[PDB]
Design a protein around this ligand. Structure first.
Ligand SMILES: N[C@@H](CCCC[NH3+])C(=O)O
Ligand SMILES: N[C@@H](CCCC[NH3+])C(=O)O
Ligand SMILES: N[C@@H](CCCC[NH3+])C(=O)O
Ligand SMILES: N[C@@H](CCCC[NH3+])C(=O)O
Ligand SMILES: [K+]
Ligand SMILES: [K+]
Ligand SMILES: [K+]
Ligand SMILES: [K+]
Ligand SMILES: [K+]
Ligand SMILES: [K+]
Lengths: 292, 292, 292, 292
C-alpha cells in the first residue's frame, strides 16, 4: 500500500542497543489496530545509519514475521554507494516486503546524472517497487523534479518520499510524471499541505504515537475534506514540530516509552538520550495531541 | 606532519573500479618528490563512501607500504555510527599510520552532545592522534567551536580539518584550544586566507595535481610571506574552484589522468564520468596554473 | 476588490523617466477589458523606490482618473519610516482608492514588535483597508504568522500579500485570523499553489501581460477547479519565472513594450535596460504563453 | 582618516525623537578624547532610514560643526534611487566633510550593472571621496568583488565598507583594486579577523561605547600585533554580538544612555525601545568589557 498514513517505524532497542522483539510486536499490533496503511522498516526514524547490513535485514524480517500479513511492510534500502544499495535490495527480493524506500546518496553529493544512474541501476536489479527519498538537509544533495521525471519512466520506480518541506515540489513533480506515480510527504509539519496540493499520503514520524489520528487525517485529505483534516492537524502540530526538538528519533522513541508502546528509549551512538528539557517539551506536545 | 600541504589523495582505480597499485605508487612518489607534508588516505577525495571497510583498509595499507616511510600517512576513519568508526580505527592501531581523519557523522544529524560522545568514544579506543573533520555541506551537521574546545581536552584529539569555508571559525576555535592544537583548512579556495588567520596548513584537493605549488605556498605562509604565497594562490585559484565544477573527485581524477599521474579516471557510482564541458573547464584551469 | 487576479501595474515612463499618461491609459483599458480584479498602483513593480512622494501620488491619482470607476485601485503606501508611511497614507484618504498595500519596513530590520507598532499606527490614522506586504528577499525582514495574527485584530488591516514563496505560510496565517482576512500571493510562480492551499488571489506581475489568462486562472482556482487552472498556469510558468530573469520590473516593462501596451520600456536608475539575452529569454516565454 | 577605528555614530535623540545637540556634543568630545579616527554621521547606526533628507543633512552639519575640525566626518549619503543619492551627496559638496558612505540600493535589488551605474553616476556628481557600503542582509543585494573592481577605477571611489561578515571578500577585493583602495569592516564581530587578512580598519557600532578599546585594537592590528589586539577583541566580543540582540541601534543607544553618554535612548519607529531582557543582556556585555 503506497497511500495514506505510512509509519516510518522506530526500531525499538533494549538497554544494550539490540532490537527488542516484544516492543516491535506491540508497535506492529498498534499500527494494525490503528489503521496505518503500511510500515516503513529501517528508514531514517528506524536508525538505518547505525545498524549493520545484517542487523538491518534482521529488523525488516522480524517486522514481516510479526506483521504476519496484516499490514504491508516497505524496507529501507538506501545507500550512498550504488553497489551497496543493490546488495541490500537483493537481500529482500522474495522476502514478502511490498517495496523499498531508497534515499538519495548522502555525503558524496553526486550530480543529477549520478542520481539517475544510481536509482536506475538499483531498479534494474529487482522487481520490487521503489520509492525514491529526497531529504537534502540530511544528505547534502537534492533530487530535483527534472530528474524525478526521468526516473519515473523506469517501470518499477513508483513514487517519491519528498522531505524538503518545499511544497512547490508537489506540482513540479506531478506535471512530469504519470498519474499513477505516488507523491508522499516526508515532512510531518507540512504533510497536510502537501496532500492538499496533490500528494497521496505521508511517510510519517508522528504516526508512531498518533497512528489513528494520522490515518483519519490522511483519509479526510484524500477525500478532499481539508478543513476537517486540518482540525486534526492542528492538534498534532506541536508534536509534528517537537518530535524534532532533538535529533529524530530521540524524541519519538522517548514518546513511545512514555505511552508504554516500547520497553526502553535506548538509541545507538551518535544518538544520545533525550535531555530533561526535551522530555518536558515532548510531553506537552503529547498532551496537546490528547495522547497522555 | 600535521602542518603544511597535506594531500587528500585520490584512490586511483582501474577500469573495473578497483585500486590501481601502479597509479598509487606514481602518485605517492610524486608527493614525495614535490614536498607534500603528509597524505590523507581514503578521505572524501579518496572515495571513502564507495569502498567497503576491507577495501578501504587495503588502500590505506597499500598507501602506507608504498610511502615506505618517506611521507607520513593519515588514515580516513570516519563513520556515521560510532561502533563502526571504532571498528575502522582499530584496523589501523599499530600499523604505521601517524593519525586519523574522522568526519562528523553524516545523515543522522546528531546533536553537539552526540558529536562529543562520538569522538570521545573513538579517541578512547586508540592511541592514534585524531583530526576532527567538519564539512556541513556534506554531512548535514556542524561541529561548532564550543564542542571542538570540549573535544580538544581529550589527549589524543589534536586538530581539525575545517571545511566550512567560514573563516571566522579559525580564531573562534583557536581561542578555545591549546596552542599545540592544529587548525587545518579543508577548503582549498580559502585555505591561504585560513593560514593567514592562524591556521597551520591545508588538507587539500588541489595538491593532488599542483603538489609542488601547494607545498611552496604553504611554506611561504608558515614563514609569514603572504604576498609571495598569494601570487601562487592566484595561479591556482581557478583550479581550487574548478576542481568542484562537477562533484569531487570527478574533476581531480580526470586532471590526474590528463597529467599522466594515473592510468584511468574511473570512479564508483554514484560518481559518474566527467562531462565534456567539465573536461574543458578543468583543462583551462590546469593551463592557468601552468601545469599543461 | 481584494480577491482574484490583481495586477501590480508597471508605471510606464517616457524616455526621460517621467510617467506616460497615454501608456497608462492603454494599460488600464487593457485591465478593464481583460477582467483583472483591481490595480495596485506604485507597488514594487510600479517602481515605488524611485518615484518621490509627489510623483508617487501623481501616478496613483492619474490611475484613478483614468480608471474612471471601471476598476478598483489600491495604492502602494509602504515606507520604512512609520511617519513617512502615515504621511503618504494621508495623501490618499478620500482619493477614491479602495485600499492600501503597505510593505514591511526595508533596510532597518525592525523586530516583530516594531512591525506590529508600525502597522498599527498606520491603520489607526486612516479608514482605508490595509493589505500588509511581506517580501523578505527585498526588505531584510520577515513578518511572521504570529504577528500577522496580532495585526489582523486591527479592524482595517484586512489582508496580506505574502511574497516569501513559502507555501507553509498560507495555513499558518489562516489559522490565526478570521475567515474574512484575505490571503494574497505576491509570488507568481507559486501563486496557484498558494490559492490551492486556501489563498484568495494574487497580486501579480505576470498579469501585466497575461491579464485574461490570469483572471481565468484565479477564477477557476476560487471555484476549486485546480486541474483546469493548472493547465493555464503551465503555459504561464516560463513567464512567471522569466519576468525575474533580470530585476523586476525590467523584463515586464520590456514585455509590455514588445506587445505594444506601452510606448517605451524606460526605467529609473538603479534599474537598467534589459540585456539582449534577457530579451531573448522573455520573448520565448511570451511565445510559450501564446501572447506573441 | 579612512583607516583605524571609525565610529558609525548614533544620532542621539530627545524624547520627541529629534536630534539632541548636548548629547551629540558629548559623544563627539568622547571620540576626540578616545582616539577614534573618524565619524560616520547618519549611517545605518545613525538611523538614516527614519530621518528625512533635511533632518539627515542637519545632523551631518551639526556633527561637522561640533567636531570643529578635531576629527574628520564622513556623511552617510546612500539611497535606493540614484537621483536621490545624487541630491543627498550634493548637499554636502564643499561642506567640510571628508567623504561619503554610500550603501547599495536597498529593496529594489538592482543588477551588478545597475550597481555600477548607480555608484558611477553618484561619483560623477561630486569631488568627494566615496566609500561603497555592502550589507546584503539589509538591502537584498550583494555588491560582488568584480563590480567593486570595476568601480574602484573611478577616481573618487576609494574604498568599501564590507558588512557581509564573509572574510573571503577581503582578498578577493584586494586583488582587483589598487594598493591605495581602502578595505573597511562593517561587521564588528569579524573586524579583527578582517584586518588580519589585510583590511585597513572598521566602521564600527561597538566604538560608540568602547571607543578607546576599539581605537587601541585597531592600532595594534595596523602594527601587526594581532595577539595583543585579540585580547582586547575578546573582552569586546560579547558587546560585538549583544549590540545586535535587538535590532541595531536599539542596544547601542541604550548602552550609550547607561554609560551617561547620551540623555535618552529614544529612537524612531519602527525601531522600538529595548526590552527588559535586552537591557540585561547588554548590561552583562558592558560589564565583561569593563565599561560598567
Ligand atoms: N553506517 C553506514 C552503513 C549502514 C548500512 C546498513 N543500514 C551508512 O549510513 O551508510
Ligand atoms: N558507504 C557507507 C560505508 C562506507 C564504509 C567506509 N569506508 C558510508 O559512507 O558510511
Ligand atoms: N527612495 C525611497 C523613498 C521613496 C518614497 C516614494 N515612494 C524609499 O524607497 O523609501
Ligand atoms: N526612509 C527613506 C528615505 C530616507 C531619506 C534619507 N535620509 C529611505 O530609507 O530611503
Ligand atoms: K527491474
Ligand atoms: K514508473
Ligand atoms: K588534545
Ligand atoms: K482606523
Ligand atoms: K481586521
Ligand atoms: K579610485
Amino acid at each position: 500500500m503506497f497511500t495514506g498514513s505510512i509509519v516510518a517505524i522506530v526500531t525499538p532497542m533494549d538497554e544494550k542497543g539490540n532490537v527488542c522483539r516484544a516492543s516491535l510486536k506491540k508497535l506492529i499490533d498498534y499500527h494494525v489496530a490503528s489503521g496505518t496503511s503500511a510500515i516503513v522498516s529501517v528508514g531514517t526514524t528506524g536508525e538505518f545509519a547505525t545498524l549493520n547490513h545484517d542487523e538491518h535485514a534482521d529488523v525488516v524480517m522480524m517486522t514481516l514475521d510479526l506483521a504476519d500479513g496484516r499490514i504491508p511492510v516497505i524496507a529501507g534500502t538506501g545507500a550512498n554507494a550504488t553497489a551497496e544499495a543493490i546488495s541490500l535490495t537483493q537481500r529482500f527480493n522474495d522476502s514478502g516486503i511490498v517495496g523499498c524506500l531508497t534515499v538519495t546518496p548522502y555525503y558524496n553529493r553526486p550530480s543529477q546524472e549520478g542520481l539517475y544512474q544510481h536509482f536506475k541501476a538499483i531498479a534494474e536489479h529487482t522487481d520490487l517497487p521503489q520509492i525514491l527519498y529526497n531529504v537534502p538537509s540530511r544528505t547534502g544533495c537534492d533530487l530535483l523534479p527534472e530528474t524525478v521525471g526521468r526516473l519515473a519512466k523506469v517501470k518499477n520506480i513508483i513514487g517519491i518520499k519528498e522531505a524538503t518541506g518545499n511544497l512547490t515540489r508537489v506540482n513540479q513533480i506531478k506535471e512530469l510524471v504519470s498519474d499513477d506515480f505516488v507523491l508522499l510527504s516526508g515532512d510531518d509539519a507540512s504533510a497536510l499541505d502537501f496532500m492538499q496540493l496533490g500528494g497521496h499520503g505521508v511517510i510519517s514520524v508522528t504516526a508512531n504515537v498518533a497512528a489513528r489520528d494520522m490515518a483519519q487525517m490522511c483519509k479526510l485529505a484524500a477525500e478532499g475534506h481539508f478543513a476537517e483534516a486540518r482540525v486534526i492537524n492542528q492538534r498534532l502540530m506541536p508534536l509534528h514540530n517537537k518530535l524534532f526538538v532533538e535529533p529524530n528519533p530521540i524524541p519519538v522513541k522517548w514518546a513511545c516509552k512514555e505511552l508504554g508502546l516500547v520497553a526502553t528509549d535506548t538509541l545507538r551512538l551518535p544518538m544520545t538520550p533525550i535531555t530533561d528539557s526535551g522530555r518536558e517539551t515532548v510531553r506537552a506536545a503529547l498532551k496537546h495531541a490528547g495522547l497522555l
